[PDB]
Amino acid sequence: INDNRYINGINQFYFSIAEGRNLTLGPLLNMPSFIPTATTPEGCTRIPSFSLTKTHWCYTHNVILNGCQSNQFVSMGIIEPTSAGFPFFRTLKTLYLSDGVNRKSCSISTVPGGCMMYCFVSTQPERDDYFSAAPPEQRIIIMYYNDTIVERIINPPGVLDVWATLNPGTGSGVYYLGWVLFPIYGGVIKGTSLWNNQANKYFIPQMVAALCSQNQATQVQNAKSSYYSSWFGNRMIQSGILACPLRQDLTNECLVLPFSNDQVLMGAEGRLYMYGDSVYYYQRSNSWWPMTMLYKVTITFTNGQPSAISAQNVPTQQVPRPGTGDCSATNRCPGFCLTGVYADAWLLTNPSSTSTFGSEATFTGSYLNTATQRINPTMYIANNTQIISSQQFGSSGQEAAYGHTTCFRDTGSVMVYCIYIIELSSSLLGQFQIVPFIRQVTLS
Amino acid sequence: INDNRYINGINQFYFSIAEGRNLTLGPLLNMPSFIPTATTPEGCTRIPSFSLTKTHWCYTHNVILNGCQSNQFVSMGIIEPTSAGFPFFRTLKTLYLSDGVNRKSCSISTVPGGCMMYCFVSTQPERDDYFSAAPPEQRIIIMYYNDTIVERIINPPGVLDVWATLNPGTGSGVYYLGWVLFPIYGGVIKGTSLWNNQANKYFIPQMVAALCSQNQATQVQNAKSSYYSSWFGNRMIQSGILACPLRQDLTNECLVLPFSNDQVLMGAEGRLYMYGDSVYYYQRSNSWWPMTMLYKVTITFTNGQPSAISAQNVPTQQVPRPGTGDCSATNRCPGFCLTGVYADAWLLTNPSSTSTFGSEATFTGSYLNTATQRINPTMYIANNTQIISSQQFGSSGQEAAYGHTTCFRDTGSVMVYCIYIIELSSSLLGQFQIVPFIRQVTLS
Amino acid sequence: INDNRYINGINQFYFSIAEGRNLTLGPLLNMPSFIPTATTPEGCTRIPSFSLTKTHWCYTHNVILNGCQSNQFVSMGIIEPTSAGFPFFRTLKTLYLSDGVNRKSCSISTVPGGCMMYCFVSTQPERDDYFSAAPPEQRIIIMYYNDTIVERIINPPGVLDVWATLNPGTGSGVYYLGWVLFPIYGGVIKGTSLWNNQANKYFIPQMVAALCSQNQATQVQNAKSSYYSSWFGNRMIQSGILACPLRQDLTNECLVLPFSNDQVLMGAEGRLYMYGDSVYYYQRSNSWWPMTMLYKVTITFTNGQPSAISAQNVPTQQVPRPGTGDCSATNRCPGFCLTGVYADAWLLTNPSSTSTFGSEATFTGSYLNTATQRINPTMYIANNTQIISSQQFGSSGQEAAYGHTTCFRDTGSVMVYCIYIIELSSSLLGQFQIVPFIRQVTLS
Amino acid sequence: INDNRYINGINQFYFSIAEGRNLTLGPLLNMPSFIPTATTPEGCTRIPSFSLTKTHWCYTHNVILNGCQSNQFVSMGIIEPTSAGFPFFRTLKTLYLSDGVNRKSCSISTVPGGCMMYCFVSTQPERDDYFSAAPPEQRIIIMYYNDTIVERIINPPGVLDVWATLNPGTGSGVYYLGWVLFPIYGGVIKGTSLWNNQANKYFIPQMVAALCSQNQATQVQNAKSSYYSSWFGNRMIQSGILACPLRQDLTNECLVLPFSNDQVLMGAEGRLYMYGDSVYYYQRSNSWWPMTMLYKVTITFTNGQPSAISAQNVPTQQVPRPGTGDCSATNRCPGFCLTGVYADAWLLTNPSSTSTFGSEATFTGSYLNTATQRINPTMYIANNTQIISSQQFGSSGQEAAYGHTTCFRDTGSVMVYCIYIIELSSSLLGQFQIVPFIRQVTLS
Ligand SMILES: *[C@@H]1O[C@H](CO)[C@@H](O[C@@H]2O[C@H](CO)[C@@H](O)[C@H](O)[C@H]2NC(C)=O)[C@H](O)[C@H]1NC(C)=O
Ligand SMILES: *[C@@H]1O[C@H](CO)[C@@H](O[C@@H]2O[C@H](CO)[C@@H](O)[C@H](O)[C@H]2NC(C)=O)[C@H](O)[C@H]1NC(C)=O
Ligand SMILES: *[C@@H]1O[C@H](CO)[C@@H](O[C@@H]2O[C@H](CO)[C@@H](O)[C@H](O)[C@H]2NC(C)=O)[C@H](O)[C@H]1NC(C)=O
Ligand SMILES: *[C@@H]1O[C@H](CO)[C@@H](O[C@@H]2O[C@H](CO)[C@@H](O)[C@H](O)[C@H]2NC(C)=O)[C@H](O)[C@H]1NC(C)=O
Ligand SMILES: *[C@@H]1O[C@H](CO)[C@@H](O[C@@H]2O[C@H](CO)[C@@H](O)[C@H](O)[C@H]2NC(C)=O)[C@H](O)[C@H]1NC(C)=O
Ligand SMILES: *[C@@H]1O[C@H](CO)[C@@H](O[C@@H]2O[C@H](CO)[C@@H](O)[C@H](O)[C@H]2NC(C)=O)[C@H](O)[C@H]1NC(C)=O
Ligand SMILES: *[C@@H]1O[C@H](CO)[C@@H](O[C@@H]2O[C@H](CO)[C@@H](O)[C@H](O)[C@H]2NC(C)=O)[C@H](O)[C@H]1NC(C)=O
Ligand SMILES: *[C@H]1O[C@H](CO)[C@@H](O)[C@H](O)[C@H]1NC(C)=O
Ligand SMILES: *[C@H]1O[C@H](CO)[C@@H](O)[C@H](O)[C@H]1NC(C)=O
Ligand SMILES: *[C@H]1O[C@H](CO)[C@@H](O)[C@H](O)[C@H]1NC(C)=O
Ligand SMILES: *[C@H]1O[C@H](CO)[C@@H](O)[C@H](O)[C@H]1NC(C)=O
Ligand SMILES: [Ca+2]
Ligand SMILES: [Ca+2]
Ligand SMILES: [Ca+2]
Ligand SMILES: [Ca+2]
């Protein structure tokens, strides 16, 4: 179990609104990395997922032997203090799922006594998945600290003949009230109930108006069209949550809960968080709006089962991501787009602490500082409109990809540490080196 | 425990003399590295030690937060096959000794149910250790797989007032007949019994004559002087073995067994191996002879206690190491030298299988292919006089340091794999990145 | 162990009713304090707990680095005579629980061979604890004189879903018939069995009638309402006792025994005492009645387990405490109040020695002599209606807070000494300086 | 024993000459004080002595019940890290020597397994001691951690009829090569061998010339006269060292070793230190030169017994002390003086590391910043000519007295902490409150 110094400093808003204004990033600190490196120049390690809870943490990433176009590495352990005062992620178990099953886009989550991981089995190019009317096989693997492993092929209702494809968001899932929730996304088939119930719905971030040159009627029209991709088999690209009861005999008990397209952007990879008793969702900006999308999620239970989800966006115009064409970091107008990168963000302040939800919110993470290239990885702290602290890693031109950020407090020294897991392009070993950067978020 | 595919393919001579002639190195294979990386540009990870036995493996290295001038990372696990057929070193436990005790030059060894590690506590520059008449504190830490940890300060007899300094060789120790043996080295004080019993002794490798331009009388004179260093407090630089009975209450039961200077070169870092029931020793070439030094060690027991050791050198003139001044890779004449690098080698063939010990021996490892710089890491297979297979890693100029090689056979596919643990200079994260390269040693 | 001069003079009523009338306080005596001071102007040391038994004493207090809004200091030792004749509390062991766990409101008790301490883990403002339906984590730490330490998270039955919060009373617990008893208090949830069984119950001290201007029917109505706080999450503020069997593997064996609200006032901090074989309870006056509340407790065992407690109040109208608003030291009428200070009192005379329980009782302690401010610390001796001896410490305006009093007799010189542990506001080092004042209670 | 984080960071020069230039004092940190407070307004606690060694620390001070014109408190324990990273001096044993023997001016020293304390028995005003030809009784008490206590009255040779008085310097003694060394001082009788061998000797600090307005011949004449006090019975006020072999049956084995008056100023209180294998001495400036006096001491052994001592002064003109009349902090000219205060200093840099001994030395401690009053306690870091960092404690006018400073490094976090034990005048409890201030000495 995690050291006494951390058990009470996990999954919470660490600073008050007032303190958020005076936060700065400290130096990067050196700890033994718990994320394995490739041993060949061409080896590819990508798509990390990290979940940290009161008792322990779970980590996983995909490994491809030659180039990035597989096996899945899983790790679990605890956090303990070093003589220098900062954390050391102590690995207590390692697993390497290598058996011919092409598990991809995996999301992992901590569960009592272990880790639960959700993946889909890839057997063809992603685009092909959207055209085929049949969805890929879905699997959830439970790995207990006692070395028992139980993998199950799941068939949640409302998937067959509704979703042409379904993928985990790769971002971490969370254990909530006895259920394990994972972010999901995919393409929905035209004419289905889901498609019809979503017809004419769209979402436009609160701060777009002041930045978009188009008029309200034009924005609305374009936003509605941003949820359908002709390139991806003419499907409605949908975001949602997969709720699975913690059981070892899962078959069709997991539930697919899509977000209303009136509250969320075009479906994309994502991540789920827990701040106190509240669930939050991060949605990759793979559509027209290039800014960090975070939402407070309200989950409704009907007869002990998740029945519906509602999302409330934390309005911002900060931390853009690189994109292609008319959907770069400089875009501000609605339209159909299918480009971007995963770059989640951690809320250091409570958005509900303000009279108007998210009026003044502070968050931290990493982002690729450039308009269209996956370059210049930069760790930062920002509020709704400005970056109040940042530090680029490496020299300009340094290639990078996804970034997963997680923060926690050591209740002993009373300092907050954040880990920024970044896929870095390496010239020595492997295509990428996934690095768990760690530093302190200093108040002052 | 290690998978059934490896339990019977460890610590043995894998090929016959005839087969050794047709061995070649296969491609480097990509597996998730079990050696942790640094998370800052200046973080320094160095001095690895690796021990692999029938049941499991132990690994460790030193971590310094800023630059390479500390904490000690320890790891243990097993080996299991991947769907591609090659090994995956599965970590089952990690430890990070971080408590203010500056444990250095650590050597680790597998023991039933865990790992036993031997280190010395550094409190001043190495050179200062040789001048002070008092030796540094010596410690042996036993780490059981059940998480029990027992560290002891040891005071073996014949150390105080005999050795000005004593260090583990950093290379792996071995578990032999109930005792854990570690390679050691240091400086002996003038006028001591050890010094007197070693007076006038010297060793000249069998193949030096044909390569050295000096006459026999001159070589002998210079060789005798190569065991005394005026730079290192005027001490006799001695190599030896530390034998410790496997106990949890060690105090003064461990025994210091020095090698006779008539059979070994000037003391240096080293490593111990087990090939069947035979113990072998690798001695770093930190003196005048720049070639790989391997010896078969004969251990004598008197009353259940190791009482003396004898070494028989495997005569070679292959695989040189970079050195400074008149002691570079091109040197062949005896004289005092104190320069070199650690680069052990694994014997793929049995030296005793030939009528004349080591007349035709084959070994593999890595070496820095250059005369004086620690550059051009190159993995190879060689016999007594030639390199019969090799492959440089990276582009010329690539900096590197130590290299620890370990080979084992998968008795299922019947192929031999060797892991080359190499300290590589990295430009991205940390001063060095210790990489566990792995490939196959192919017969044909 | 305590010196022979004290082993037989602990936890007893030292004077007869007749002698109690002629008791006066002697000068304060100077002994080396056994309570550590802060080393910074802002350091905060508060909330002491002190337990003294036949063999030894246990002491503890909370330490907060900046201001009083943590770590827990623990100390244990014995009492021995000085050449001047008075006591010296000799510390034989010190401990500083500093590990990130925010242990608060701790109560300590002597146990054979050590100390047992009970705390709760605070993670949010106190008021928040009452609103959340989940109670804070509860912990009991046993610290043996042999340096073994065993901490356990306890989950006594009848706490979850009954008590929104639960805290130790901070006053000392006592070792009784193999069980360690601690005073407790907190908020009970509406609709629970406890709440229902307590419905319509109330307690009005025997001497209130003659001092209250309201009529009997009005007093009764207001008293009933004094047990419910809308400010503290609409909970019934309850007082009680936590009984824990002396074991090192405690989980759910400790028992929560609430006092009947027909015999005790609104729940508050408290302390348990032992006078001979009788258990006594002190209840902080945090409600409407501002006078010292002491009760003789009768404990019932069913099958070797504490099953119920009954309290009999020692009727007084002496020694008031400062309070806010209509609940100051001058208040005498029932109503809802949530203000006051901890100020226990030691009974120098046996309340049962009189035909009518407590008809003539004498006690000693400290109290803040003022109506609404925590000012003017004053040590005293008093009977049911008057203060018969007193001495203010410092000059008027001197700030102070809690006061823990403990008396014992030196059977050698035959004199009674009392220690008054008082939190004093200091201008030099720290926010408060907890001082163990000591003097004699003279007969004459 | 001390935590692993400190065992290797004690009694050493922590910084290089270059680093000494960039040292600053950090904030004062709050830890539970290990020095007991008085419990009455008039209680007097004074004259602390503190010794810290690899394994543990020893502490002691004098306690007088009424005013400062007795009993002796002794404490011993270890150092361990807190969750905030800084030290906590954990007391493991306390003792209170209270038995009618007036032990004064005690100096304490750590010894293997305990503490050895040296005191003299006062029976009359100090001045009377100098006039009486008979010296006061001398005692050394050994207190082992196992609670065994052995006190002995000692009669070292060369004391009777030579020294009219003899006192420990109150500063800590040190354990050196099997002997416990304590600083001493007193008055020598006219006509004795010591007096004759010291006749015409004098010492003038290297930096006095440039600051003194008198000529060389006048300075020399006045300096010679500064070693004789007509006020103190016309004795030669001498400084020295008392060497005692670590034995439990001491009688006349301890040796009185006086310093040559050609290398040291008029006798005064003092302290002994150990930096590596070197012994250093601090001499209170109770004579004409008001600046910090530190000397490297060379001890000569003849037949296993200390036979002579030699002192080499570290030349400075920094950190003056308050004095009376023509001997205030502003004085610079030789002459007879008998005024000053104890204020030792710790060397953060090695004086021998410079080509010219002490040419650039850095030290830290506390000093009363004023010309003639014991006021304005101020902690500082200084070099030979300037104070490069300082912070006054309290508001101007704050009375204080002695200051004992001790520094050590936590080899885990790699930071240096210094404890400044200062006698502070308090208005609340006791005449003085001896406070163990602690902070970090930051490099940068
Ligand atoms: C490892 O821990 C898991 C989690 O408890 C154990 O799982 C139990 O498995 C049995 C069937 O094999 C179920 O009936 C239980 O309900 C499971 N426990 C629950 C509720 O999670 C697993 O058995 C453990 N490994 C072993 C066999 O030691
Ligand atoms: C985000 O942070 C920025 C920078 O701190 C805030 O901008 C400052 O706003 C204050 C007004 O309260 C001005 O006094 C400063 O001059 C602004 N800084 C500058 C120069 O840009 C910004 O208001 C924050 N956004 C919010 C309100 O969340
Ligand atoms: C080491 O390997 C080399 C290369 O295989 C051996 O050299 C060969 O020796 C044979 C004689 O048996 C010749 O026919 C080849 O022409 C040699 N190779 C060349 C061209 O260098 C060498 O003999 C081996 N060393 C030993 C005997 O251990
Ligand atoms: C310190 O004293 C305690 C109190 O006796 C010892 O506790 C015992 O612990 C063992 C398990 O470790 C139990 O089985 C015993 O019942 C305990 N004794 C009882 C009844 O209190 C503790 O072991 C002592 N410390 C040591 C190990 O020397
Ligand atoms: C508490 O103590 C007071 C003071 O000693 C008692 O009051 C005295 O009562 C006696 C009657 O027995 C009178 O003779 C005195 O004049 C009273 N003292 C004064 C002047 O106040 C009081 O009775 C005691 N309370 C009890 C009975 O416990
Ligand atoms: C506490 O420790 C001291 C230190 O070892 C013990 O002292 C020994 O006392 C005996 C006589 O009583 C001597 O003969 C030994 O030489 C002493 N030891 C030495 C060399 O220091 C002391 O006895 C211990 N306390 C006990 C009795 O347990
Ligand atoms: C003690 O410290 C002072 C302050 O750092 C030193 O004075 C400085 O000396 C340098 C020359 O190397 C000048 O450049 C600075 O201007 C001086 N500081 C000032 C303005 O006073 C002083 O030299 C040090 N004393 C020594 C040499 O030990
Ligand atoms: C943060 O720093 C600013 C600038 O000094 C200060 O005014 C503010 O009070 C700080 N915020 C808080 C309340 O911690
Ligand atoms: C190795 O290869 C050579 C060349 O083909 C062959 O002649 C030889 O028999 C082989 N060695 C053995 C016996 O495996
Ligand atoms: C206490 O003092 C009173 C007044 O002198 C005296 O009458 C009484 O007897 C004393 N009490 C006892 C019995 O000790
Ligand atoms: C100390 O700080 C000064 C000023 O920045 C810098 O020049 C110097 O190198 C530092 N000293 C060292 C070597 O640590
Ligand atoms: Ca499909
Ligand atoms: Ca040495
Ligand atoms: Ca609650
Ligand atoms: Ca005298």
DSSP-derived secondary structure for C16-48: -HHHHTTEEEEEE------SPPPSSSS-EEEEE
Which secondary-structure segment (H or E) carries B434?
strand B432-443
Which secondary-structure segment (H or E) carries C222?
helix C216-225
b/e code A191-226 from CB counts within 10 Å (16+ = b): ebebbeebeeebbbbebbeeebebeeeebeebbbeb
Strands, sheet with B87-97, edge to edge from the N-terminal-most edge strand: B44-52, B57-64, B71-81, B87-97
**Best CA proximity match to A362, nearest among A345, A337, A379, A341:** A345
The amino acid present at D151, given as its one-letter code, is E
- What is each CA distance from C154 to B19, B361, C334, in whole angstroms? 67, 66, 36
CA pair distance D285, D338, nearest whole angstrom: 9
Q: Give the residue ranges of DSSP H helices in C235-389.
A: none
Q: How many CB atoms lie within 10 A of CB B19?
A: 14
Which secondary-structure segment (H or E) carries D131?
helix D126-131
CA pair distance B136, B440, nearest whole angstrom: 41
Q: Cβ distance B39 to A436 under 8 Å?
A: yes
Q: Cβ distance B44 to B167 under 8 Å?
A: no
* Fold (topology level) of A1-444: Neuraminidase (2.120.10)
Give the torsion sign (CA, C332, C334, C337, C343): positive
C chain contacts of residue D73, beta-carbon cutoff 8 Å: 32
Alpha-carbon B262 to chain mean position: 21
Contact C91 D94 (CB under 8 A): yes
A chain contacts of residue C101, beta-carbon cutoff 8 Å: 4, 7-8, 411
Alpha-carbon D158 to chain mean position: 24
Q: How many CB atoms lie within 10 A of CB A178?
A: 9
Strands, sheet with D432-443, edge to edge from the N-terminal-most edge strand: D23-28, D432-443, D415-425, D400-410
Pocket of ligand 6 (CB under 6 A): D 113, 144, 146, 148
Q: Cβ distance D255 to D302 under 8 Å?
A: no
b/e code C333-357 from CB counts within 10 Å (16+ = b): bbbbbbbbbbbbbbbbbbbbbeeee
Contact A5 C99 (CB under 8 A): yes
Alpha-carbon A215 to chain mean position: 32
**Best CA proximity match to A293, nearest among A274, A313, A309:** A313
Contact D37 C38 (CB under 8 A): no
Q: How many CB atoms lie within 10 A of CB B293?
A: 25
| Nearest-5° Cα angle at A102, A98 to A106 | 95
Pocket of ligand 2 (CB under 6 A): A 360, 383-386, 388
CA pair distance C38, B52, nearest whole angstrom: 53
Whether the CB of A85 is below 8 Å from some CB of chain D: the reply is yes
The amino acid present at A21, given as its one-letter code, is R
Pocket of ligand 8 (CB under 6 A): A 18-19, 22
Written as six digits, the tokens of C253 are 């064996």
Written as six digits, the tokens of A253 are 């008990």
- What is each CA distance from C184 to A334, C157, C171, C243, C259, in whole angstroms? 61, 15, 9, 10, 10
Give the torsion sign (CA, B388, B394, B400, B406): negative
> Which method was it determined by?
X-ray
Q: Is C201 exposed, middle or buried (0-12, 13-18, 19+ CB in 10 A)?
A: middle
CA pair distance B174, B49, nearest whole angstrom: 12
Helices (H) and strands (E) in chain D, counts: 4, 26
- List CB contacts of A148: < 8 A, sequence separation 6 or more: none
b/e code B88-113 from CB counts within 10 Å (16+ = b): bbbbbbbbbbbbbbbbbbbbbbbbee
Q: Which chains touch B (3 or more CB pairs under 8 A)?
A: A, D
Given the structure tokens 């750590």, which residue do they identify?
D110
Three-state DSSP at D156 gives coil
Q: Cβ distance D404 to D49 under 8 Å?
A: yes
- List CB contacts of B441: < 8 A, sequence separation 6 or more: B14, B23, B24, B25, B26, B348, B364, B381, B407, B416, B417, B418
The amino acid present at A40, given as its one-letter code, is T
CA pair distance C248, B153, nearest whole angstrom: 32
**Best CA proximity match to D261, nearest among D200, D327, D187:** D200
**Best CA proximity match to D264, nearest among D344, D203, D184:** D203
**Best CA proximity match to C313, nearest among C347, C354, C358, C272:** C358
Q: Cβ distance A319 to A387 under 8 Å?
A: yes
DSSP state of C291: B
In angstroms, what is the span from residue B19 Cα to ligand 9's centroid?
A: 7
CA pair distance A279, A297, nearest whole angstrom: 5
Residues linked to residue C301 through DSSP beta bridges, in sequence order? C306
Q: Measured between alpha carbons, how far apart are the two ends of chain B, in Å?
A: 32
Q: Which of B32, B39, B65 sits opposite A84 (nearest CB)?
A: B65
CA pair distance B315, B361, nearest whole angstrom: 9
In angstroms, what is the span from residue A151 Cα to ligand 1's centroid?
A: 14
CA pair distance A182, A139, nearest whole angstrom: 12
Written as six digits, the tokens of A82 are 């070093």
Written as six digits, the tokens of A193 are 């109930």
CA pair distance B405, B273, nearest whole angstrom: 11
The amino acid present at D179, given as its one-letter code, is W
Q: Cβ distance B367 to B375 under 8 Å?
A: no
Give the torsion sign (CA, C170, C174, C180, C181): negative
CA pair distance C39, C65, nearest whole angstrom: 10
| Nearest-5° Cα angle at B202, B200 to B206 | 150
Which secondary-structure segment (H or E) carries C126?
helix C126-131
Which secondary-structure segment (H or E) carries C295?
strand C293-301
Written as six digits, the tokens of B116 are 């036993």
Whether the CB of A32 is below 8 Å from some CB of chain B: the reply is yes
| A322-328 contacts, C-beta under 8 A, 24 or more apart | A322/A368, A322/A370, A322/A371, A322/A372, A322/A373, A322/A374, A322/A375, A323/A290, A323/A371, A323/A372, A324/A372, A325/A372, A327/A287, A327/A288, A327/A290, A328/A290, A328/A371, A328/A372
DSSP strand pairing (D44-52 vs B44-52): unpaired
CA pair distance B226, B331, nearest whole angstrom: 14
Cα-atom radius of gyration of chain C, to the nearest Å? 20
Phi, then psi, of C20 in degrees rounded to 5:
-55, -25
b/e code B235-250 from CB counts within 10 Å (16+ = b): bbbbbbbbbbeeeeeb
DSSP state of D36: P
- What is each CA distance from D105 to D62, D67, D167, in whole angstroms? 8, 17, 7
Can chain D be said to touch chain B, i.e. do they have 3 or more Cβ pairs within 8 angstroms?
A: yes
- Counted across chains B and D, CB pairs separated by less than 8 A come out at 23
Whether the CB of A80 is below 8 Å from some CB of chain D: the reply is no
One-character DSSP codes across A388-421? EEEEE-SSTT-BEEEEEEEEEEETTTTEEEEEEE
Given the structure tokens 């243990």, which residue do they identify?
B76
- What is each CA distance from B60 to A31, B51, B77, C332, D221, in whole angstroms? 15, 9, 12, 73, 69
Written as six digits, the tokens of D50 are 């503190």
Three-state DSSP at C197 gives helix
Q: Which residue of B has its CA nearest to D10?
A: B123
Given the structure tokens 């009470």, which residue do they identify?
A8
Whether the CB of D414 is below 8 Å from some CB of chain A: the reply is yes
Residues linked to residue C441 through DSSP beta bridges, in sequence order? C25, C416
Give the torsion sign (CA, D3, D5, D8, D10): negative
- List CB contacts of A396: < 8 A, sequence separation 6 or more: A375, A376
DSSP state of B352: G
The amino acid present at C84, given as its one-letter code, is A
**Best CA proximity match to B430, nearest among B33, B35, B37, B36:** B37
In angstroms, what is the span from residue D92 Cα to ligand 4's centroid?
A: 21
D chain contacts of residue A410, beta-carbon cutoff 8 Å: 83
- Altogether, the residues listed in chain A come to a count of 444
One-character DSSP codes across A205-255? -TTSTTT--S-HHHHHHHHHHTTEETTTTTEEEEEEEEEEES-SS-SS--E
Given the structure tokens 């040391």, which residue do they identify?
C45
Strands, sheet with A415-425, edge to edge from the N-terminal-most edge strand: A23-28, A432-443, A415-425, A400-410
CA pair distance B45, B422, nearest whole angstrom: 11
| Nearest-5° Cα angle at B371, B370 to B375 | 35
Give the torsion sign (CA, A190, A193, A198, A200): positive
In angstroms, what is the span from residue C2 Cα to ligand 6's centroid?
A: 25
Q: Cβ distance C75 to C17 under 8 Å?
A: no
Contact C123 A5 (CB under 8 A): no
The protein residue with its alpha carbon nearest to ligand 8, atom 7, reads A22
Written as six digits, the tokens of C330 are 């001058």
Three-state DSSP at A194 gives helix
CA pair distance B26, B440, nearest whole angstrom: 5
Residues linked to residue A434 through DSSP beta bridges, in sequence order? A423
CA pair distance D146, D76, nearest whole angstrom: 12
Residues linked to residue D120 through DSSP beta bridges, in sequence order? D104, D138
Q: Cβ distance A113 to A175 under 8 Å?
A: no
Question: Which of C63, C71, C99 is the best residue to mutate to test the A interface, defined by the most A CB atoms within 10 Å of its own CB?
Answer: C99
CA pair distance A327, A371, nearest whole angstrom: 9
CA pair distance A194, A236, nearest whole angstrom: 10
DSSP strand pairing (C255-258 vs C235-245): antiparallel
Q: Cβ distance A57 to A436 under 8 Å?
A: no
CA pair distance B413, B405, nearest whole angstrom: 21
Written as six digits, the tokens of D373 are 């009053």
DSSP strand pairing (D179-188 vs D163-168): antiparallel
CA pair distance B132, C253, nearest whole angstrom: 60
The amino acid present at C426, given as its one-letter code, is S
CA pair distance D30, C430, nearest whole angstrom: 9
Given the structure tokens 């009255």, which residue do they identify?
D153
Q: Cβ distance D187 to D237 under 8 Å?
A: yes
CA pair distance D317, D291, nearest whole angstrom: 6
In angstroms, what is the span from residue A316 Cα to ligand 2's centroid?
A: 14
One-character DSSP codes across A31-99? ----SPPPSSSS-EEEEEEEEE-SS-EEEEEEEESSS---EEEEEEEEEEE-TTSSEEEEEEEEEEE-S
Whether the CB of A11 is below 8 Å from some CB of chain C: the reply is no
Q: How many CB atoms lie within 10 A of CB A82?
A: 21
| Nearest-5° Cα angle at B148, B143 to B153 | 60
Q: Cβ distance D117 to D74 under 8 Å?
A: yes
- What is each CA distance from C213 to A25, C56, C208, C219, C332, in whole angstroms? 64, 48, 9, 9, 8
Give the torsion sign (CA, C96, C97, C98, C104): negative
| D145-149 contacts, C-beta under 8 A, 24 or more apart | D145/D56, D145/D76, D145/D92, D145/D93, D145/D113, D145/D114, D146/D113, D146/D114, D147/D93, D149/D95
Phi, then psi, of B300 in degrees rounded to 5:
-105, 130
Three-state DSSP at C365 gives strand
Alpha-carbon torsion angle A432, A433, A436, A441, nearest 10: -70
**Best CA proximity match to B269, nearest among B348, B358, B346, B171:** B171
Given the structure tokens 């038994």, which residue do they identify?
C53
Q: Is A273 exposed, middle or buried (0-12, 13-18, 19+ CB in 10 A)?
A: buried
CA pair distance B32, B435, nearest whole angstrom: 10
Written as six digits, the tokens of C226 are 């004094």
Q: Please, how many CA atoms are within 13 Å of residue A354, restricted to the half-sphere of its CB? A: 16
CA pair distance B323, D239, nearest whole angstrom: 57
Rounded to a whole number, what is the largest CA-CA distance in chain B?
A: 61
CA pair distance C404, C57, nearest whole angstrom: 14
Q: Which residue of A has its CA nearest to C100?
A: A412
**Best CA proximity match to B233, nearest among B284, B164, B166, B286:** B164
Written as six digits, the tokens of A203 are 């979402």
Rounded to a whole number, what is the largest CA-CA distance in chain C?
A: 61
- List CB contacts of D199: < 8 A, sequence separation 6 or more: none
Q: After which residues is chain A broken (C to N over 2.5 A)?
A: 69
